[PDB]
Design an enzyme around this catalytic site. Structure first.
Site, PDB file in Angstrom:
ATOM      1  N   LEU C   9       0.841  -1.348   0.156  1.00 49.79           N
ATOM      2  CA  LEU C   9       0.025   0.028  -0.091  1.00 49.79           C
ATOM      3  C   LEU C   9       0.966   1.185   0.016  1.00 49.79           C
ATOM      4  CD1 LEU C   9      -3.217  -0.586   2.202  1.00 49.79           C
ATOM      5  CD2 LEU C   9      -2.791  -0.307  -0.363  1.00 49.79           C
ATOM      6  N   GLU C  11       4.607   3.413   2.145  1.00 51.40           N
ATOM      7  CA  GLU C  11       5.402   3.512   3.266  1.00 51.40           C
ATOM      8  C   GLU C  11       4.914   4.651   4.149  1.00 51.40           C
ATOM      9  OE1 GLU C  11       9.694   2.804   3.073  1.00 51.40           O
ATOM     10  OE2 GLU C  11       9.702   2.760   0.951  1.00 51.40           O
ATOM     11  N   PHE C  14       6.687   5.807  10.593  1.00 48.82           N
ATOM     12  CA  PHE C  14       6.942   4.872  11.662  1.00 48.82           C
ATOM     13  C   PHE C  14       6.810   3.441  11.068  1.00 48.82           C
ATOM     14  CE2 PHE C  14       6.337   8.582  14.616  1.00 48.82           C
ATOM     15  CZ  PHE C  14       7.509   8.410  15.414  1.00 48.82           C
ATOM     16  N   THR C  16       5.329   0.443   7.769  1.00 44.53           N
ATOM     17  CA  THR C  16       4.979   0.105   6.295  1.00 44.53           C
ATOM     18  C   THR C  16       3.775  -0.453   6.345  1.00 44.53           C
ATOM     19  OG1 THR C  16       7.622  -0.004   6.051  1.00 44.53           O
ATOM     20  CG2 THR C  16       6.048  -0.721   4.299  1.00 44.53           C
ATOM     21  N   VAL C  17       2.872  -0.091   5.369  1.00 50.28           N
ATOM     22  CA  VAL C  17       1.469  -0.609   5.124  1.00 50.28           C
ATOM     23  C   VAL C  17       1.383  -1.429   4.054  1.00 50.28           C
ATOM     24  CG1 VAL C  17      -1.005   0.048   5.326  1.00 50.28           C
ATOM     25  CG2 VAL C  17       0.668   1.451   6.335  1.00 50.28           C
ATOM     26  N   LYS C  26       0.018  -2.782   9.314  1.00 49.06           N
ATOM     27  CA  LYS C  26       1.186  -1.854   9.615  1.00 49.06           C
ATOM     28  C   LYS C  26       2.141  -2.271  10.372  1.00 49.06           C
ATOM     29  CE  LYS C  26      -0.730   2.137  10.801  1.00 49.06           C
ATOM     30  NZ  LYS C  26      -1.025   3.142   9.828  1.00 49.06           N
ATOM     31  N   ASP C 113      -4.016  15.225  15.842  1.00 50.38           N
ATOM     32  CA  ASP C 113      -3.419  15.139  14.511  1.00 50.38           C
ATOM     33  C   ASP C 113      -4.637  15.376  13.413  1.00 50.38           C
ATOM     34  OD1 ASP C 113      -1.427  15.304  12.916  1.00 50.38           O
ATOM     35  OD2 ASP C 113      -0.736  13.228  12.900  1.00 50.38           O
TER      36      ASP C 113
HETATM   37  N1  LIG Z   1      -6.123   1.180   7.187  1.00 48.58           N
HETATM   38  C1  LIG Z   1      -5.594   1.524   5.957  1.00 48.58           C
HETATM   39  N2  LIG Z   1      -5.952   1.307   4.925  1.00 48.58           N
HETATM   40  C2  LIG Z   1      -5.180   1.792   3.749  1.00 48.58           C
HETATM   41  N3  LIG Z   1      -4.193   2.610   3.877  1.00 48.58           N
HETATM   42  C3  LIG Z   1      -3.685   2.738   5.020  1.00 48.58           C
HETATM   43  C4  LIG Z   1      -4.410   2.269   6.195  1.00 48.58           C
HETATM   44  N4  LIG Z   1      -3.747   2.857   7.211  1.00 48.58           N
HETATM   45  C5  LIG Z   1      -2.907   3.584   6.896  1.00 48.58           C
HETATM   46  N5  LIG Z   1      -2.502   3.589   5.341  1.00 48.58           N
HETATM   47  C6  LIG Z   1      -1.966   4.001   4.475  1.00 48.58           C
HETATM   48  O1  LIG Z   1      -0.728   4.479   5.035  1.00 48.58           O
HETATM   49  C7  LIG Z   1      -0.259   5.552   4.693  1.00 48.58           C
HETATM   50  C8  LIG Z   1       0.958   5.865   5.685  1.00 48.58           C
HETATM   51  O2  LIG Z   1       0.255   6.653   6.573  1.00 48.58           O
HETATM   52  P1  LIG Z   1       0.050   5.922   8.389  1.00 48.58           P
HETATM   53  O3  LIG Z   1       0.783   4.565   8.266  1.00 48.58           O
HETATM   54  O4  LIG Z   1      -1.217   5.682   8.581  1.00 48.58           O
HETATM   55  O5  LIG Z   1       0.830   6.856   9.446  1.00 48.58           O
HETATM   56  P2  LIG Z   1       2.260   7.209   9.711  1.00 48.58           P
HETATM   57  O6  LIG Z   1       3.034   5.831  10.004  1.00 48.58           O
HETATM   58  O7  LIG Z   1       2.533   8.125  10.778  1.00 48.58           O
HETATM   59  O8  LIG Z   1       2.876   7.823   8.369  1.00 48.58           O
HETATM   60  P3  LIG Z   1       2.396   9.254   7.741  1.00 48.58           P
HETATM   61  O9  LIG Z   1       3.688  10.125   8.200  1.00 48.58           O
HETATM   62  O10 LIG Z   1       1.279   9.888   8.358  1.00 48.58           O
HETATM   63  S1  LIG Z   1       2.318   9.441   5.851  1.00 48.58           S
HETATM   64  C9  LIG Z   1      -1.520   6.501   4.741  1.00 48.58           C
HETATM   65  O11 LIG Z   1      -1.308   7.712   4.711  1.00 48.58           O
HETATM   66  C10 LIG Z   1      -2.527   5.362   4.167  1.00 48.58           C
HETATM   67  O12 LIG Z   1      -2.177   5.520   2.556  1.00 48.58           O
END
Ligand SMILES: Nc1ncnc2c1ncn2[C@@H]1O[C@H](COP(=O)(O)OP(=O)(O)OP(O)(O)=S)[C@@H](O)[C@H]1O
Ligand SMILES: [Mg+2]
Lengths: 279, 65, 286
Positions: C9, C11, C14, C16-17, C26, C113
C-alpha cells in the site's frame, strides 16, 4: 472509560475460583511441557501465589524509590500487569524478577511517563553490567508481556474514582463536615485492597467506594444515607443490596489476606532458582 | 432523509453524573483546584477535571461480572 | 502468518503498510511508543467513524497492527479535480468526522493530528478517524502536554502561542480548517512557519483582542501582532449559506473555551437543514 473498557470486558472475573482455575491451568500446562520435554522440582500453585505476592511487594518497593518519581497511576498499571501476566503464566517459565521490571517498563511507556532506558536501569541496585543485562532481559520480555496481556494496555485504577467520590462527598454530603479527614485511612485501605485479587474481581469505582466507607466506619461515621439518597439507591433496592454485598466481600478479601513469610519465601526462592537453572 | 441530532447513549452502569455546564451552579467547583489564567487561555477549565473525576467515580459502580 | 501479504500500500514515517487478506497491516528503547499509543487507545474505542484495530502481533520489537482496509482518504478526494464536492457531500464528510470526534472526546481523548489525509474513506463511503500516533487523554490537571502537536497548517492559535494545557479546541479548530479545505479545495492557512501561521490566521480572521480572548496574553509564547481587520467570512466562502457560515464562525472562535465542541457543532442548524448529507454509497469515489 471503564464502563466499556477492555479491563471490564476481558479482565474482570466472576469469582476467586475462576482465578484459581486459571492459575492451576497455567501451572499444570507448564508441568506438562516440562514432563514431555525431559518430581519435587515443580512448584505448587499456592507456592507460585506466595512468590507472586512477594514479587508484587518487591515491585511496589522498586516503584517507591524510583527516580524520577513515578506517578501512582504508573505503579498501579504495573501491578495490574504483574497480576494479569501471572494469571495465565507460571513463575517457573518466566522469572518474576524480570517480569516485574518489564511490567514497570511497559507501564511507564503506556501511562506516558517518559523515562529513558539508562535512567530506568540506574534505579536498579546493581553494578553497571547488571543494569545492561537487566535492560536486555526487559527488552526481550516486553513483547511477551504485551502478548500475554492480549494487547490490552489501558488500566483503570481506583485513584481517580476516589478523588471523584471525595468531590461528590464535599459537594452533596454536608453531614460529613470535612471528607478530607477520611483520606489517609482510606488510602491505607486502598493499599491493602491492592494486595489482594480484588483488582481482578471488582470495578475501580467499587474499590474506591469500599475504601472510603471502610475509612468512615473506622472513624465511627455512618454513611449509608450517601448510598441511599445521594446515589439514589432508594429507587432500586436490589442495586443497593448488591453494592453492599460487593463491599462486604471486598472487605472479607482484605480480612483473609495472608502476607508471605520470610522463611517460606526463602525456601520457595531456592526452589524457583533451582527450577530455572535446571530448565 | 434529513439529519437529526441524537445523543450518544452509552450505558455507564452507575449513578448519573451532572452536566458539565451545571457543575459551577451545583457547587462542585468549590472543591477543585482553580484553573490558572494560563490554563484558561489554552481552553483548560477546572470543570473538565471535576467532570472527569465524577465520571470515573460513577462508572461501573453498579456493574457485576 | 494467518494473513497473506497481497499488495504493497505505501510507506510511512513509523511503519510500512500492506493490503492483505481484506485488511491493512502496518509494520535499546524497546517497542516504539507511537505503535504502543495506537494499540492502547484503539483497543478501548469502538465507533463506526474511528478506525478499528482488528488484531496485533509481532516479533522482537517489530510489531504488526491490523486495521480495516480503507480505500482512500479525504485529501485524495480534495485534490481530485475530477470530483465535484457538493454541499451534501461536504455535509456528509463533516457529519461523520464530527460524530467520530464526539465519541472520542466523550472518552476524554484528543486526536491532536486531524487533517484530511488522516480521515480515511472505505469502499462504502464511511469516514474514519485514523493515525492515533499523537492522540492523548485529556482532563487531568497534573499532566503536562506539548504545544508542538497538530500539523502546522491545522494548528490552533493557542498551540501556536505555546499552550501547555488545552482541551477539545485543538481538535475543533483543525476541523474548521478541514471544512475550509473542503470548500476551497486548497489549504486554508498554509503557513511555512509558526510565526507565518499566526500571521496568516490573523490576516484572515482578524487579530484577536482581549474581548474575544480574555487571557490570551498569559500564554508562554504570546507575542504581539498588528491589528488586522480580517476578511468577512462570506467574502472567503462566497457559496456558503448562512448556517454554514455560523458553523465556520463557531469553529474558528479564538477563545478556546467559547469555540464550539463536537456536540454543539452537531446540534447546529446547518446539519439539520436542507439538503441532507449524502449517503455513504453515493459519496464521490476517486
Ligand atoms: N487502514 C488503512 N488502509 C489503507 N491504507 C492505510 C491504512 N492505514 C494507513 N494507510 C496508509 O498508510 C499511509 C501511511 O500513513 P500511516 O501509516 O497511517 O501513519 P504514519 O506511520 O504516521 O505515516 P504518515 O507520516 O502519516 S504518511 C496512509 O497515509 C495510508 O495511505
Ligand atoms: Mg497519516
Amino acid at each position: 472509560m471503564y464502563h466499556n473498557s477492555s479491563q471490564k470486558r476481558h479482565w474482570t472475573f466472576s469469582s476467586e475460583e475462576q482465578l484459581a482455575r486459571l492459575r492451576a491451568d497455567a501451572n499444570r500446562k507448564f508441568r506438562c511441557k516440562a514432563v514431555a520435554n525431559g518430581d519435587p522440582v515443580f512448584l505448587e500453585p499456592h507456592e507460585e501465589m506466595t512468590l507472586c505476592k512477594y514479587y508484587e511487594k518487591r515491585l511496589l518497593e522498586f516503584c517507591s524509590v524510583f527516580k524520577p518519581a513515578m506517578p501512582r497511576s504508573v505503579v498501579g498499571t504495573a501491578c495490574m500487569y504483574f497480576k494479569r501476566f501471572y494469571l495465565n503464566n507460571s513463575v517457573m517459565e518466566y522469572h518474576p524478577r524480570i517480569i516485574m521490571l518489564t511490567c514497570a517498563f511497559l507501564a511507564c511507556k503506556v501511562d506516558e511517563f517518559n523515562v529513558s532506558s539508562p535512567q530506568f536501569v540506574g534505579n536498579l541496585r546493581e553494578s553497571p553490567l547488571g543494569q545492561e543485562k537487566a535492560l536486555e532481559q526487559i527488552l526481550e520480555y516486553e513483547l511477551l508481556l504485551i502478548q500475554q496481556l492480549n494487547f490490552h494496555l489501558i488500566v483503570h485504577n481506583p485513584y481517580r474514582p476516589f478523588e471523584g467520590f471525595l468531590i461528590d462527598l464535599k459537594t452533596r454530603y454536608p453531614i460529613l463536615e470535612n471528607p478530607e479527614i477520611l483520606r489517609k485511612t482510606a488510602d491505607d485501605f486502598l493499599n491493602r485492597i491492592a494486595l489482594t485479587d480484588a483488582y481482578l474481581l471488582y470495578t475501580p469505582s467499587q474499590i474506591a467506594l469500599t475504601a472510603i466507607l471502610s475509612s468512615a466506619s473506622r472513624a465511627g461515621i455512618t454513611m449509608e444515607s450517601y448510598l441511599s439518597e445521594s446515589l439514589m439507591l432508594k429507587e432500586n433496592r436490589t442495586c443497593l443490596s448488591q453494592l453492599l454485598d460487593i463491599m462486604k466481600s471486598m472487605r472479607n478479601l482484605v480480612k483473609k489476606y495472608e502476607p508471605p513469610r520470610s522463611e517460606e519465601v526463602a525456601v520457595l526462592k531456592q526452589k524457583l532458582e533451582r527450577c530455572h537453572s535446571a530448565e | 432523509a434529513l439529519y437529526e441530532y441524537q445523543p450518544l447513549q452509552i450505558e455507564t452502569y452507575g449513578p448519573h453524573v451532572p452536566e458539565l455546564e451545571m457543575l459551577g451552579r451545583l457547587g462542585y467547583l468549590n472543591h477543585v483546584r482553580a484553573a490558572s489564567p494560563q490554563d484558561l487561555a489554552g481552553g483548560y477549565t477546572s470543570s473538565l477535571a471535576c467532570h472527569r473525576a465524577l465520571q470515573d467515580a460513577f462508572s461501573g459502580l453498579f456493574w457485576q461480572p | 502468518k494467518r494473513y497473506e501479504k497481497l499488495d504493497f500500500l505505501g510507506e510511512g514515517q513509523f511503519a510500512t503498510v500492506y493490503k492483505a487478506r481484506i485488511v491493512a497491516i502496518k509494520k535499546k528503547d524497546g517497542i516504539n511508543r507511537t505503535a504502543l499509543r495506537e494499540i492502547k487507545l484503539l483497543q478501548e474505542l469502538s465507533h463506526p467513524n474511528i478506525i478499528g484495530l482488528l488484531d496485533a502481533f509481532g516479533h522482537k520489537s517489530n510489531i504488526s497492527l491490523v486495521f480495516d482496509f480503507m480505500e482512500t482518504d479525504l485529501e485524495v478526494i480534495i485534490k481530485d479535480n475530477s470530483l465535484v464536492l457538493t454541499p451534501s457531500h461536504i455535509k456528509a464528510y463533516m457529519l461523520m468526522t464530527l460524530q467520530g470526534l464526539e465519541y472520542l472526546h466523550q472518552h476524554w481523548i484528543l486526536h491532536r493530528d486531524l487533517k484530511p489525509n488522516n480521515l480515511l474513506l472505505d469502499e462504502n463511503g464511511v469516514l474514519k478517524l485514523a493515525d492515533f500516533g499523537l492522540a492523548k487523554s485529556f482532563g487531568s490537571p497534573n499532566r503536562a502536554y506539548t504545544h508542538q502537536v497538530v500539523t502546522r497548517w491545522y494548528r490552533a492559535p493557542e498551540l501556536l502561542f505555546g499552550a501547555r494545557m488545552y482541551g477539545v479546541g485543538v481538535d475543533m479548530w483543525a476541523v474548521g480548517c478541514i471544512l475550509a479545505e473542503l470548500l476551497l479545495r486548497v489549504p486554508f492557512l498554509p503557513g511555512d512557519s509558526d510565526l507565518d501561521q499566526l500571521t496568516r490566521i490573523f490576516e484572515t480572521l482578524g487579530t484577536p483582542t482581549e474581548e474575544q480572548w480574555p487571557d490570551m496574553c498569559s500564554l508562554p509564547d504570546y507575542v504581539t501582532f498588528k491589528s488586522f481587520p480580517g476578511i468577512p467570512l462570506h467574502h472567503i466562502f462566497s457559496a456558503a449559506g448562512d448556517d454554514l457560515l455560523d458553523l465556520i464562525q463557531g469553529l474558528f472562535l479564538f477563545n478556546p473555551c467559547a469555540r464550539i465542541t463536537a456536540t454543539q457543532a452537531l446540534k447546529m442548524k446547518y446539519f439539520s437543514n436542507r439538503p441532507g448529507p449524502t449517503p455513504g454509497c453515493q459519496l464521490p469515489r476517486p
